[PDB]
Design a protein around this ligand. Structure first.
Ligand SMILES: Nc1ncnc2c1ncn2[C@@H]1O[C@H](COP(=O)(O)OP(=O)(O)OP(=O)(O)O)[C@@H](O)[C@H]1O
Ligand SMILES: Nc1ncnc2c1ncn2[C@@H]1O[C@H](COP(=O)(O)OP(=O)(O)OP(=O)(O)O)[C@@H](O)[C@H]1O
Ligand SMILES: [Mg+2]
Ligand SMILES: [Mg+2]
Lengths: 221, 91, 745, 86, 222
């Protein structure tokens, strides 16, 4: 016997998260409403017509078993119900992994084709079949209670206009947390990454937290 | 003119000479004499050179006119490693 | 202006006051200008007596638009009415760059005959404004040899002419100058790329990567937890050390290594020796001569093919390669020919030279010429006369095809005959119906294969959405192999046509996904090659992740083809991430000799030229297409439709067709005397700057380097300082820098 | 001094600096300074120019950067205490 | 602006097309971790769900009568139970050793496949999988330091042949020390970018753990 050799490089999930997926339409330039933008948009439209006609033809003569609604309906049959939530312990192979149920028992199961293999990392929550415990999905972890606490959901009502006398202090903080995001071109043309960190120090009540409240008010991050 | 042809030859970059160099010789001579004199005219060893004439390898036995040479023809010197008999005798 | 305004808004302005148009407002004329084009289409031939005031407005609308930087709107007015002829008279010094850049971006989406018309009109602006180097680029895109002559000789600045000769040499277009032209000698040397070897070696010494690399350093088996193996490492050794002249395995005493291979393994191994000596015609031929006298048949013809590699990409004033290969095209032994025609093709690919073709032509019709050499003959003569529509090569390719019997047309070496025909009409477009007429006589299913190959090659690099409409119609009907042989080229066709510009290209990836999903095995066996063609030497993550998923495919051919495409996509990019995948793929496919051979092949291509060589057919900011490169690209990829029998079989020498596409990713700044001149440059991802006025940055996420640097796919180059004025706006290949008089004022 | 000059060139490689930036002088103005400070000096030097709406950083900006980083921020410097530990 | 009306017509038709394309193509949703339908080999999955049976992870404890032809294996099935089982017919007797993890069935618990040793997922993530964007050319003033660092941690792996021939045992450890900002981690990041072997990054604060014996345990599994 020989150990199985994975074809995927590494054991971590793909770094990219929350992309446009199949809707990653190209950045047609320029945004101005002119002919070549119309010409560029037409080419995108044309290939879609080609794509639409081709896909329809294949599914038209595809077997009744092999249909978009049938295969998805089948997928539930392979998954079954209920879908046990486990924990990924190790990725032995491309289609094989060790998972542990909530009872602490580990099983060497097979990862089915329809599972998103790029979302699989050890410690992640996986969906397992109730009977055969095979990996049949990855549960998107809900926002942790610790995540909610740090995140400021609503921007504070304190703005820079509500800060008096800290003209230089306001200016310095903008170039490190506001200007790089609003106007990144200034830094790129200069060839310098923005100032990495910033610390606000002074006597109590001088406006250190207030400037951060102003920063949080006018930030897209 | 007068039985002498303008033969422009090419030299390899290892011998840092003027690559646009001119060799003048008769046409009644054969490739054996031609190969020897090119080595002398640009300071080369005759044993390790191949010559390209009229888009075809310089056959040593046959004389120049019956080879197919002409006026204002182009030539090249090909540096050789191991002699033609030595390479055959090598293995 | 407020309501629809059909034949009204223009009418009152036309009949009413005929004062200066801008006096009524910029928004009014913008509405007025649009309606000018609207009724122009409505107006018929009999309504020529209605356009008298119509021409007057455009003679004033255009100056108004360029006055307030609304220039892209102006070009739009003449485009719709098909009167872009009068734009050049009113072009000013402050806005010449914006109109040409806008119009040139439009030629990739407008169809014929407005392709050339917009190209010539953009060419006229450059010629009038004395911007010759960019005018030559437009002429090359038009493939107008007469214009290339006229553009070249019109310039009296020899410094510009010297830099111009580089672009012709980079494209592989040769120009026969007259001795009366000043500086005739250096001009022919520059375009012939005779100094390319020394210039390429100059960077290697500068970039301290001259040291040879053994395939073991690429395999890295010490980190891993046969005849085919030896043949694989022969390609890896050649690919990694390509065009370098030095190697620790063949430049040394290679007889032990050369004889380690067996059968046709020694054919490619001997030929791999010339790939280290690529572009080194003088010193490279000095090393092959030892193996030229070998008694074993494979070594000599393998060396005979190594002749064609050593002159590939270089034009010698008198050719050495023809001398070494003329007397072996009709040799009794088939192998000796096999190294002759294929070598002869690579040495003069993109030449259209009659002497070689006449010497190469009767080989195809030879009775003793097997189908293997007959297809090789088609590949070669197609490569010499690529994109030339030479009727002489065309006549025989048909003549050989229909003379052959129906049974031997089943052989996959007959697939190279339409490719030679297709290459001969590469990119011409509407010049194949007469040829397509002759192809109906040929029997099926080869006629289905033959017409698809030439039709695809006719529209290569055109982006014609109409042409790719029929190819998917071929892809729509799936056959329950023998009948669907032509299906593979149809998938490969989408890549060959959409490759012209970015927008058309990445639509193809979406379609390529469905073909890999809904397609039949033979249909999906060609999708990886289309990925390799669409993005050669451009290692994007979307394709590489796509190719990775089907690397371990159930269908063996898709498995081999995907692995080769992965290395082909990152050919010469030295991608650290991609090499890790191949190393992981080597472990997974270690027990599969067929799969592992592609894995080793991809590692060599990934480290082609030690990261200093590219196979991309597009240079000059990815706008100008090299006919030679696609010919080698098409030769390998079409041959990969039968990877089991051609690549994995006895004809793996066809991988040497990639030599015709091997060029350096170069940015070398030369002085006016052509000596190296290292200066600070900025290298970063290219940015589209159509539209937005003012001065937009053409590079993002850039870094500052000295000039002798390698530019992979998609990165532009701008001079960091203003001390030197480049001759060409395109900072690619060899560029001549002129000292700026304004600098140090 | 040779090392600090080298670090200055590494971090000021992609800067749009003037022609005559005396990096040897800048290395001499920060005798005992870490490479991180030199990076901040380069970053702050471009910050004085970006503040002034200038696309090219002059030598004066680097001079002001050294004063702001090496001198003004010397109160928070970790070097004086950590050379005793090393 | 004369094409503003025509832009939105083709933009809306395009947006309708992607929505239409996604209808037949599928790939809608992903919250249950579903791969795009182009990768669905449902024919193989149905066979996989039947032909390939699930295997419980167990640890071999003791081999009884290994010399004879009836070797009995005592296994520890995690939290389930302990069983005395025999090997399957498709696994060699020499491939299972005491103390190693094995895969056992749910019917007779016979060992079916040897398994990799259990490793903490936190320790697994401590290995570097994306190399940093720092090279040795980005470190200035550390010439002599860099050669000493490379010749211990980079050269022996790259060119091991020059050490075995002379009977050389290269040093297997380097300590980088200096004041903050001097380039200790920067040089280490350069090492990871250039190295081709496996690189594991450990932060000393990551080895501090709540329970007694964890930090030693994580070092052991590291
Ligand atoms: N310069 C200022 N201009 C306007 N309001 C100010 C200013 N400084 C302080 N304030 C007011 O003081 C309030 C409380 O001070 P703040 O929370 O900002 O203190 P701090 O400087 O962060 O100090 P610490 O956290 O040490 O107590 C703020 O909500 C703000 O309204
Ligand atoms: N020799 C150097 N050459 C170039 N840049 C340097 C050098 N030393 C430090 N830097 C810069 O300073 C930064 C300081 O981070 P670095 O990881 O090098 O610090 P360190 O020595 O590990 O410090 P600490 O002791 O706080 O962990 C680096 O990211 C780098 O940009
Ligand atoms: Mg506070
Ligand atoms: Mg550190």
């Amino acid at each position: 016997y020989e150990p199985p050799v994975p074809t995927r490089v590494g054991k971590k999930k793909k770094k990219t998260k929350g992309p446009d997926a199949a809707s990653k339409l190209p950045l047609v330039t320029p945004h101005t409403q002119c002919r070549l933008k119309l010409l560029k948009l037409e080419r995108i439209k044309d290939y879609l017509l080609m794509e639409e006609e081709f896909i329809r033809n294949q599914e038209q003569m595809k077997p009744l078993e092999e249909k978009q609604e049938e295969e998805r309906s089948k997928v539930d049959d392979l998954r079954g119900t209920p879908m046990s939530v486990g924990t990924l312990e190790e990725i032995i192979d491309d289609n094989h992994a060790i998972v542990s149920t909530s009872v602490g028992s580990e099983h060497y199961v097979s990862i089915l084709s329809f599972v998103d293999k790029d979302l699989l990392e050890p410690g992640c929550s996986v969906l397992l079949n109730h009977k055969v415990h095979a990996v049949i999905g990855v549960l998107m972890d809900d926002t942790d209670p610790l995540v909610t606490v740090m995140k400021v959901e609503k921007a504070p009502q304190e703005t820079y206009a509500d800060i008096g006398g800290l003209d230089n202090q306001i200016q310095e903080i903008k170039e490190s947390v506001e200007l790089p995001l609003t106007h990144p071109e200034y830094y790129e043309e200069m060839g310098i990454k923005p100032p990495k960190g910033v610390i606000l120090y002074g006597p109590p009540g001088t406006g250190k937290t207030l400037l951060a409240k102003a920063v949080a008010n006018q930030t897209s991050a | 003119t007068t039985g002498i042809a303008t033969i422009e030859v090419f030299l390899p970059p290892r011998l840092k000479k003027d690559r646009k160099n001119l060799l003048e010789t008769r046409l009644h001579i054969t490739g054996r004499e031609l190969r020897s004199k090119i080595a002398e005219t640009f300071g080369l060893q005759e044993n390790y050179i191949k010559i390209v004439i009229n888009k075809k390898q310089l056959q040593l036995g046959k004389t120049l006119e019956e080879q197919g040479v002409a006026h204002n023809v182009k030539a090249m010197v090909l540096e050789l490693k191991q002699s033609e008999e030595d390479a055959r005798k090598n293995f | 202006m407020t309501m629809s305004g059909e034949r009204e808004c223009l009418k009152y302005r036309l009949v009413g006051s005929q004062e200066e148009l801008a006096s009524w407002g910029h928004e009014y004329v913008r509405h007025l200008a649009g309606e000018v084009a609207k009724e122009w289409q409505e107006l018929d031939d009999a309504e020529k007596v209605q356009r008298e005031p119509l021409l007057t407005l455009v003679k004033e609308i255009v100056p108004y638009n360029m006055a307030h930087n609304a220039e892209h709107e102006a070009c739009d007015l003449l485009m719709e009415i098909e009167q872009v002829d009068m734009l050049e008279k009113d072009i000013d010094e402050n806005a010449y760059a914006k109109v040409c850049l806008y119009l040139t971006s439009c030629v990739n989406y407008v169809p014929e005959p407005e392709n050339s018309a917009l190209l010539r009109c953009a060419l006229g602006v450059f010629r009038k404004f004395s911007r010759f180097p960019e005018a030559l680029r437009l002429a090359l895109m038009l493939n107008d040899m007469e214009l290339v002559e006229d553009i070249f000789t019109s310039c009296k600045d020899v410094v510009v002419q010297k830099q111009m000769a580089f672009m012709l040499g980079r494209h592989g277009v040769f120009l026969e100058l007259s001795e009366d032209v000043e500086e005739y000698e250096d001009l022919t040397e520059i375009m012939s790329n005779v100094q390319l070897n020394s210039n390429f070696l100059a960077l290697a010494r500068e970039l301290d990567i001259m040291e040879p690399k053994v395939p073991d350093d690429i395999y890295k088996t010490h980190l891993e937890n046969s005849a085919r193996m030896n043949l694989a490492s022969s390609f890896v050794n050649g690919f990694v050390n390509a065009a370098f002249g030095q190697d620790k395995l063949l430049t040394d005493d290679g007889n032990k290594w050369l004889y380690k291979n067996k059968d046709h393994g020694m054919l490619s191994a001997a030929a791999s020796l010339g790939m280290i000596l690529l572009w080194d015609v003088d010193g490279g031929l000095t090393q092959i001569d030892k193996y030229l006298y070998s008694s074993e048949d494979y070594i000599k013809s393998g060396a005979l093919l190594a002749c064609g590699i050593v002159n590939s990409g270089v034009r010698n004033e008198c050719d050495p390669a023809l001398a070494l290969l003329s007397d072996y095209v009709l040799h009794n032994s088939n192998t000796m020919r096999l190294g002759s025609i294929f070598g002869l093709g690579l040495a003069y690919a993109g030449s259209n030279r009659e002497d070689v073709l006449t010497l190469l032509l009767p080989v195809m019709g030879d009775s003793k010429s097997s189908m293997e050499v007959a297809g090789v003959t088609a590949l070669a003569c197609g490569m010499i006369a690529v994109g030339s529509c030479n009727g002489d090569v065309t006549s025989t390719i048909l003549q050989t095809i229909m003379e052959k019997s129906e049974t031997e047309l089943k052989d996959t070496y007959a697939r190279w005959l339409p490719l030679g025909l297709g290459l001969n009409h590469l990119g011409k477009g509407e010049a194949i119906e007469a040829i397509l007429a002759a192809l109906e006589v040929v029997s099926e299913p080869f006629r289905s294969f033959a017409n698809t190959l030439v039709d695809v090659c006719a529209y290569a690099g055109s982006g014609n959405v109409l042409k790719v409409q029929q190819l998917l119609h071929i892809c729509s009907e799936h056959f329950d192999a023998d009948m669907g042989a032509h299906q593979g080229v149809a998938v490969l066709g989408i890549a060959l046509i959409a490759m012209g510009e970015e927008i058309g290209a990445e639509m193809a990836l979406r379609t390529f996904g469905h073909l890999l999903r809904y397609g039949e095995p033979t249909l999906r066996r060609a999708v990886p090659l289309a990925l390799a063609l669409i993005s050669v030497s451009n290692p994007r993550l979307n394709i590489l992740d796509t190719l990775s998923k089907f690397s371990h495919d159930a269908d063996p051919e898709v498995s081999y083809n995907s692995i080769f495409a992965m290395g082909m996509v990152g050919s010469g990019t030295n991608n650290a991430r991609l090499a890790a995948m191949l190393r992981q793929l080597a472990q997974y496919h270690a027990k599969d000799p067929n799969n592992l051979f592609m894995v080793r092949l991809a590692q060599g291509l990934t480290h082609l030229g030690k990261g200093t060589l590219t196979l991309c057919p597009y240079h000059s900011d990815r706008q100008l297409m090299s006919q030679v490169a696609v010919a080698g690209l098409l030769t390998v990829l079409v041959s990969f439709l039968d990877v089991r029998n051609i690549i994995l079989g006895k004809s793996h020498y066809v991988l040497y067709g990639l030599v015709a596409a091997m060029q350096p990713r170069m940015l070398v700044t030369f002085d006016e005397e052509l000596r190296p001149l290292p200066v600070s440059v900025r290298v970063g991802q290219a940015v589209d700057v159509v539209g937005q006025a003012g001065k937009p940055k053409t590079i993002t996420g850039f870094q500052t380097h000295t000039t002798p640097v390698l530019l992979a796919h998609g990165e532009r180059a701008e001079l960091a300082t203003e001390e030197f004025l480049p001759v060409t706006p395109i900072l690619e290949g060899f560029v001549i820098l002129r000292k700026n008089p304004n600098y140090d004022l | 001094l040779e090392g600090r000059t080298h670090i200055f060139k590494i971090h000021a490689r992609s800067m749009s600096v003037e022609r005559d930036i005396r990096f040897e002088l800048l290395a001499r103005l920060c005798p005992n300074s870490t490479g991180a400070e030199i990076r901040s000096v380069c970053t702050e030097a471009g910050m004085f120019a970006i503040r002034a709406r200038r696309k090219i950083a002059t030598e004066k900006d680097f001079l002001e950067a050294v004063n702001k980083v090496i001198k003004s921020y010397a109160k928070f410097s970790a070097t004086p205490r950590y050379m005793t530990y090393n | 602006s004369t094409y503003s009306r025509q832009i939105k017509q083709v933009e809306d038709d395009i947006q309708q097309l992607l929505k239409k394309i996604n209808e037949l193509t599928g790939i809608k949703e992903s919250d249950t971790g579903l791969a795009p339908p182009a990768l669905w080999d449902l024919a193989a999955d149905k066979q996989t769900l039947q032909s390939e049976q699930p295997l419980q992870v167990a640890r071999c404890t003791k081999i009884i009568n290994a010399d004879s032809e009836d070797p009995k294996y005592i296994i520890n099935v995690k939290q389930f139970a302990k069983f005395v089982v025999d090997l399957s017919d498709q696994v060699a007797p020499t491939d299972i050793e005491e103390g190693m993890r094995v895969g056992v069935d749910r019917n007779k618990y016979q060992i079916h496949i040897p398994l990799p040793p259990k490793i903490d997922p936190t320790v697994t993530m401590m290995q570097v999988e994306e190399k940093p964007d720092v090279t040795y050319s980005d470190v200035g003033g550390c010439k002599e330091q860099i050669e000493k660092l490379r010749e211990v941690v980079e050269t022996p792996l790259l060119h091991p042949e020059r050490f075995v021939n002379l009977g050389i045992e290269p040093p297997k450890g380097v300590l980088l020390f200096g004041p903050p900002g001097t380039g200790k981690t920067l040089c280490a990041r350069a090492v990871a970018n250039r190295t081709d072997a496996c690189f594991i990054r450990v932060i000393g604060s990551e080895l501090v753990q709540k329970y007694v014996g964890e930090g030693a345990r994580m070092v052991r599994e590291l």
